[PDB]
Paper text:
In mutant RDM1-12, Cys206 and Thr207 do not affect the neighboring residues. The D210A and S211A substitutions, located close to the threonine triad, despite the presence of two small nonpolar alanines, do not affect the conformation of the adjacent side chains but modify the pattern of hydrogen bonds to water molecules. The side chain of Glu234, rotated towards Arg238, has a slightly different conformation and a different pattern of hydrogen bonds in the two subunits. In other variants, for example RDM1-12, differences are visible in the regions of α-helix 147–159, loop 200–208 and loop 116–120, while in RDM1-38 differences are only observed in the region of α-helix 147–159. Moreover, a multi-step denaturation process was observed for most of them. Analysis of T m of the autoprocessing mutants reveled that they can be divided into two groups: those with decreased (RDM1-3, RDM1-8, RDM1-29 and RDM1-37) and increased (RDM1-12, RDM1-18, RDM1-24 and RDM1-38) T m values.
l-Asparaginases hydrolyze l-asparagine to l-aspartic acid and ammonia. The prototypic class 2 enzyme is EcAIII from E. coli. EcAIII belongs to the Ntn-hydrolases, which are expressed as immature polypeptides that dimerize and then autocatalytically cleave themselves into α (∼20 kDa) and β (∼15 kDa) subunits to form the mature (αβ)2 heterotetramer (a dimer of two αβ heterodimers). The same Thr179 acts as the nucleophile in the autoproteolytic maturation and in l-asparagine hydrolysis.
Author numbering:
A (entry chain BBB), D (entry chain DDD): 179 to 312
B (entry chain AAA): 2 to 160
C (entry chain CCC): 3 to 15, 19 to 157
The structure:
């Protein structure tokens, strides 16, 4: 899996996700990447989210939409909603992975519960930040 | 808030012991070029929807990341690709699952969003919809890389 | 306080009383089947599985026998089941050679590493685990064919 | 589309959904029925839901899970959450249809915004209710 999230100068949010799945997968199987609210979600009222990791668990957890609902309904900060989903709710179901999220105020989060996640972010007009490890 | 982009190329058991700094820099260089393209587009006033589409098209093209070129192999030594895109303004989405003859599944996902009353299409029908709207038919052998084939052999027994 | 609810589809529902009574009669029989199972201590999972199996068998309702026609005069069926006790789920999409998609959805929940399978692979997964192959002609009804021509 | 939700004597919730799709649909299109959080959702701690209606709208709005999230995080009752999803949020995206829902406390709702929904419900050991029109 790969993905991207963005907030533009007009205040609009968007998310996208693309994958080839897991090595040695049976054909005609579908994980989180193409499923709205599992692998991918965006709403101008809350957040844009793109996910990576165990497909069966990100679906059962509705991981991407759960971030949006915790913020919009629950009044959690992006930081608290990402900690709740990635560090507590996914591992409790045996889900390993992470995601990238940007909220309507331009706060950014790149949580993961794995050894690593290939990742990068940057503000318009600023130097980018890159990472691999924790 | 400031305009901003984040990207990822997957989470998992990535370890410091596994790579040289030069091998790490190949991943860092790829992630940097893609976020830079995204930052330049945002600064020029382009939409979040067009920025996330272009960023995922680049991650698909990059053979280091498991989407598009560089996809993992299935049990049958094939490739089967899935993608989704969502617009936070209109709350429209488009998605394809189980496609093997489209070079860039995120572009086929964006066509489903923009040029149909549907959110999700699957398999040969998803491909036929995209081909009818000028998208190219490719052979799935275009996605194949030596590194991902060696990962397939390490994860199984030979018959 | 055990309880069941069922639906047979929402939309623009013309009909005579005898026509409407066939729907009321089918809804009453299936909901009473589920109520008796719940009273006997059968699980919520086994109750919704059986209720949707009966809605699939009933030609009045758009699932299994009585499925609507596609633009190509074919049938394509989809189903999902979720167990609130384990949070496990199973689903099939775009299947035409399985009589009861909800039973195939349950097999995926119980035996697949994945939530969802599609098309010929979903069918072959179910056949490999003892489920029977059928021709999609078995789903065809005169009423749904007439509804296709009316839509055209 | 058809569907069923149940609460058993042990407090377990479950949901199931099955369909033939829309009359005259493009083959290879997928609506809400087989997608977790769109056409089907169950959680012992919250609610069981099965949906019927415009597939692309039930997907974009994650209608089945949104019932669970409005109750868990928003403080809405089952009846309030059902009113808000089916009569407000689905029409705002051009969607028509309805759903059936049971909460872990045994409250039951069968909302719809259409001319009719074939439906029935009953407590164990009681006489059932049926309906077609509003
Ligand atoms: Cl009469
Ligand atoms: Cl009535
Ligand atoms: Na790639
Ligand atoms: Na039927």
């Amino acid at each position: 899996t790969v993905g991207a999230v963005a907030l533009d100068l007009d205040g609009n949010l968007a998310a996208a996700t693309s994958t080839g799945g897991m090595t040695n997968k049976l054909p005609c199987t579908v994980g989180a990447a193409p499923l709205v609210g599992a692998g991918c979600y965006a709403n101008n009222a809350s957040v844009a989210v793109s996910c990576t990791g165990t497909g069966e668990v990100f679906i059962r957890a509705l991981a991407a939409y759960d971030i949006a609902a915790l913020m919009d309904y629950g009044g959690l900060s992006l930081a608290e909603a990402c900690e709740r989903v990635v560090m507590e709710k996914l591992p409790a179901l045996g889900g390993s992975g992470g995601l990238i999220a940007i909220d309507h105020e331009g706060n950014v989060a790149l949580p993961f519960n794995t050894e690593g996640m290939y990742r990068a972010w940057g503000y318009a007009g600023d130097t980018p930040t890159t990472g691999i490890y924790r | 808030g400031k305009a901003v982009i984040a990207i990822h190329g997957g989470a998992g058991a990535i370890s410091r012991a596994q790579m040289s700094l030069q091998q790490e820099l190949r991943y860092i260089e790829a992630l940097s070029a893609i976020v830079e393209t995204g930052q330049k587009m945002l600064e020029a006033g382009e939409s979040a929807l067009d920025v996330v589409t272009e960023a995922v098209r680049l991650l698909e093209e990059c053979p280091l990341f498991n989407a598009g070129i560089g996809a993992v192999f299935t049990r049958d030594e094939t490739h089967e690709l899935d993608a989704c895109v969502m617009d936070g303004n209109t709350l429209k989405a488009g998605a394809v699952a189980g496609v093997s003859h489209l070079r860039n599944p995120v572009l086929a996902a964006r066509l489903v969003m923009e040029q149909s009353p549907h959110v999700m299409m699957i398999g040969e029908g998803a491909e036929n919809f995209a081909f009818a709207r000028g998208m190219e038919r490719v052979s799935p052998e275009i996605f194949s890389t030596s590194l991902r084939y060696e990962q397939l052999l390490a994860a199984r027994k030979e018959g």
